[PDB]
Write a protein that holds these residues in place. Sequence first.
Motif, PDB file in Angstrom:
ATOM      1  N   UNK A   3      71.765 -33.694 -17.143  1.00  0.00           N
ATOM      2  CA  UNK A   3      73.115 -34.228 -17.230  1.00  0.00           C
ATOM      3  C   UNK A   3      73.235 -35.720 -16.945  1.00  0.00           C
ATOM      4  N   UNK A   4      72.152 -36.420 -16.584  1.00  0.00           N
ATOM      5  CA  UNK A   4      72.238 -37.876 -16.597  1.00  0.00           C
ATOM      6  C   UNK A   4      72.375 -38.370 -18.038  1.00  0.00           C
ATOM      7  N   UNK A   5      71.673 -37.723 -18.971  1.00  0.00           N
ATOM      8  CA  UNK A   5      71.906 -38.001 -20.371  1.00  0.00           C
ATOM      9  C   UNK A   5      72.990 -37.123 -20.964  1.00  0.00           C
ATOM     10  N   UNK A   6      74.218 -37.310 -20.476  1.00  0.00           N
ATOM     11  CA  UNK A   6      75.387 -36.514 -20.853  1.00  0.00           C
ATOM     12  C   UNK A   6      76.620 -37.410 -20.914  1.00  0.00           C
ATOM     13  N   UNK A  12      77.159 -34.726 -10.821  1.00  0.00           N
ATOM     14  CA  UNK A  12      76.358 -35.056  -9.652  1.00  0.00           C
ATOM     15  C   UNK A  12      75.941 -33.755  -8.977  1.00  0.00           C
ATOM     16  N   UNK A  13      74.691 -33.339  -9.129  1.00  0.00           N
ATOM     17  CA  UNK A  13      74.193 -32.225  -8.313  1.00  0.00           C
ATOM     18  C   UNK A  13      73.777 -32.692  -6.921  1.00  0.00           C
TER      19      UNK A  13
END
Lengths: 50, 50
Positions: A3-6, A12-13
């Motif tokens: 999810x950084x590439x989202x 933020x986990x």
Amino acid sequence: GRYAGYKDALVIPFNPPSIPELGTAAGFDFELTDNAGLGHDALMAARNQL
Amino acid sequence: WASKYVNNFLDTDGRIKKVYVQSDAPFRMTPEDMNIWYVRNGSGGMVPFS
């Protein structure tokens, strides 16, 4: 990784801290305040400046 | 005569503050001043306190 590439959202986990009230040992908590009645716009101008 | 607190307004310094209505001083000083005051009746006409 997933999810950084989202593009659609900020995800933020994180593992909850054991005692959250302590935050982080390196942490600081600051309050920027409007002491002269200068208004929201002036206070956020100051926020962004700071 | 007594004045009346109506409601709050937001002064230009951002603080909630009061709004009062009262006669201007020259018209509420002496018992002859109360004769100046007009009420109106059920018909839309002004009737003096006298």
